[PDB]
């Protein structure tokens, strides 16, 4: 019952439909006059640090990022206000997903008093208005945990490494805004499985998802390059986080040099 046998295919279908509706605009950053891909990377890396400091769920982080990308798809923001958007997004995601969210004062503290309490609460309301309260969005993690049920047998390193790779994709809007969560999750699962065990995307997931290594190839080639370059990336908080024994130290594993795909 913890794997909901009678509902898991209905839920998967439903998430498939909702990811298309919650999808940010692929080309938004070129329409932002004052912010760039690089400034977004810095913000998302900081949110990883905040989630680590307050011991928040990984789902909470993924939700906050969906909210930010949706908000910036329609609202032009100056570089001095980008962190105010991020803070309000993380506050909303914590209220939705956490048993014990941090208090608003804690969210003011982590911005170093760049912003007042009143500014954070005002931005909360604006983000709710712009998104029309539509907060129950699908994430990469929601698809990953379903895919993990197809392992024969379950491997903790495969699970943590796929999580790590999905997380790295959050940092880089080019190229990852062009792929759906269910696709990033599938490429991440295949790459982690291959790296740890030598195995490949299983037939049982072809039956569930309709995705094959053929349709996954473009995202897989991107993700592979990202994994190879991760030690040199300007942003490092995800690699540091996934050194921890909580995540079986998976950021210390060596990427495969080729995929044969």
């Amino acid at each position: 019952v913890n794997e909901v046998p009678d509902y898991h295919e209905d839920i998967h279908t439903y998430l498939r439909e909702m990811e298309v509706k919650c999808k940010p605009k692929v080309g938004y950053m070129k329409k932002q006059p004052d912010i760039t891909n690089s400034m977004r990377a810095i913000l998302v890396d900081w949110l990883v640090e905040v989630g680590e400091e307050y011991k928040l769920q990984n789902e909470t982080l993924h939700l906050a990022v969906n909210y930010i990308d949706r908000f910036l798809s329609s609202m032009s923001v100056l570089r001095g206000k980008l962190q105010l958007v991020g803070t309000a997004a993380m506050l909303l995601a914590s209220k939705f997903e956490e048993i014990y969210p941090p208090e608003v004062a804690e969210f003011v503290y982590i911005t170093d008093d760049t912003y007042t309490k009143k500014q954070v609460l005002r931005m909360e309301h604006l983000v709710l208005k712009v998104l029309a309260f539509d907060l129950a969005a699908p994430t990469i993690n929601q698809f990953l945990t379903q895919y993990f049920l197809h392992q024969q047998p379950a491997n903790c390193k495969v699970e943590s490494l796929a999580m790590f790779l999905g997380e790295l994709s959050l940092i880089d809007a080019d190229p990852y805004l062009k792929y759906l969560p269910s696709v990033i999750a599938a490429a991440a699962f295949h790459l982690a499985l291959y790296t740890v065990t030598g195995q490949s995307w299983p037939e049982s997931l072809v039956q569930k998802t309709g995705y094959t290594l053929e349709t996954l190839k473009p995202c897989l080639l991107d993700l592979h390059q990202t994994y190879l370059r991760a030690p040199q990336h300007a942003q490092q908080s995800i690699r540091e986080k996934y050194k921890n024994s909580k995540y079986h130290g998976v950021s210390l594993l060596n990427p495969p040099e080729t995929l044969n795909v």
């Binding site: 019952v1 913890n2 794997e3 909901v4 009678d6 509902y7 898991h8 209905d10 839920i11 998967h12 439903y14 998430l15 909702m18 769920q57 789902e59 506050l91 909303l92 209220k95 939705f96 048993i99 969210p101 208090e103 608003v104 954070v120 609460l121 909360e124 309301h125 709710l128 208005k129 029309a132 309260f133 539509d134 907060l135 129950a136 993690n141 929601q142 945990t145 379903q146 049920l149």
Partner: protein
Amino acid sequence: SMENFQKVEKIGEGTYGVVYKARNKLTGEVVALKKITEGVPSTAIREISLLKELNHPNIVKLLDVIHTENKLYLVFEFLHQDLKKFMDASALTGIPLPLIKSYLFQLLQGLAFCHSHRVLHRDLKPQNLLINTEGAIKLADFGLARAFGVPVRTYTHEVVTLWYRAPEILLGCKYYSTAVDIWSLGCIFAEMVTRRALFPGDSEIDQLFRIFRTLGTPDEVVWPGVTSMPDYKPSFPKWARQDFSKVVPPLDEDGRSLLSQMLHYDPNKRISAKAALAHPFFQDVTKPVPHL
């Protein structure tokens, strides 16, 4: 913003704030207005976000949200009465069997739709089930609900109004799932038939002992793993399981069979809402208007 609504009277109150009956002056529609620091409450954020996609004939509809600087109004569909008040008003007449069966059939359709959309309700009790004069019954109050993942992760402990709370929650299990809302509906089926709560405890331990006195103290045969659960104690008294026909004497054989599957100890064996819709108890189900 609210210029088009005329308040009529107060109809409810809770943790959230207060509910009024009101009437749209332009369309004539009757509505329920739920009126609502740390910014917007997390219970309101969950209610609004989760009801945006839960459009179903047996789930109360969220029609609009009016979010000012100062107040937040949720504009909901209005229904005449709650099932708790109807059960009181049916005192010595009883509620006819065709109406009980229709209401249970409808509650199971609403619940299966929630579960198919990854939502746990977590507070099903007669006060949160609303009825109208045409024979509909609908699930209401999603402020205690929560969107789940597959498989589930640990969520808020000690949930569900005590009298309707499942044993896996009382025993402190790390995980709970869709089976908790089924337990609640089993308690509600018994209550419609008798008119009194099935397990009316006054503390968590008294709640457990009342359930054990009716269904037997569970062991490793009936419920594998039970003796390792965090709040299980080997000193619990060991009560014998009672012939199910003594639990709700007026219920026939099919009714008894469905109730026993909704109140199974082991959450892995408890019946799903989806599976229950095909139970032989519902072979002759219709949808009559309520008798009062």
